[PDB]
């Protein structure tokens, strides 16, 4: 049922050579970032 | 910069890329006009 | 390392290589805040300044200080290059 | 025609977070040792 | 391993050159150029003619300039 | 002796194996120097 | 009309279709003789 115009939104995905090393409202605008966590 | 690779022994102007010699004088086109050497 | 001058703060210094066009070629060795401010300082306060539109600049490289010594830069411009 | 100094070489005597790479990086401002 | 030389001079026969070095004195910014530069087989042809230390206030000027035209070849 | 082809116009100078032309001066290549001609 | 292409150096005197030099004698060859240009 996939287009192809669908398997290259699949394909279009991000692989990563690697390392090395609910949804709620915001009251206020305000964000602290922690080792990239939001 | 501008090579000339012939020279031509005529009383006519040859072309701008070529050495235009006379009887004793050695032309050649520069500023847009015949500059004799000597 | 931070003296208070204009590029972050630290100064640079520079080797430039030119080509004189007519006469012949050259070194020159700046402190100057920017590449193209080390090209101003030829064509400001070289030998050939009033005529600066001879100075052909071929080269603008830093030079960075060890943290010991050595020989930081060296350019010769030989007779049989000009 | 001349060098201008890409590497200094200094003793040990005349002298933790995360990593990019794992495996050290032999750069090409270095001389190598020819066998 | 203390401030920075400037230093012209001139390689005798084969051309002028500019370099930089840093040393602790004069005696030593111009041994360290007879000794790494690239005429370190002929260091007698070294002449050099102008030292000027690296004094930092300034920042904006030409410390070397040597140009080698077509009447001294 | 040596064959030059070629006749070149720059402030700059050319290779050894061609003239030098500027203006008015005419120069080649012999002995390592380049000897004017006039 | 006759076109020289090529230059040769040397002291005593070459070809008539090229032009002689030597130590700044610029000769080549004009109405059956060695014509110097100056």
Redesign the interface.
Known sequence: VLSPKDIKYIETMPDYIGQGAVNQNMIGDEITVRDGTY | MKTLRTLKISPNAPDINSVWLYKGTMKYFNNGEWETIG | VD?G??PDGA???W?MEY???????????????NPQ?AEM??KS????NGSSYLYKVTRI?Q?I?????????????????? | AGKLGKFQMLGFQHWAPQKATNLMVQLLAFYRGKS
């Open positions: 003296v001058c204009a100064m640079q210094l080797v080509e004189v066009t007519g006469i012949g070629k050259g070194c020159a060795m700046c402190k100057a805040i401010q300082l030829l306060n070289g030998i050939y490289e030079v200080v060890p943290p010991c010594n050595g020989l930081m830069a060296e350019q010769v411009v030989t007779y049989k290059d000009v």
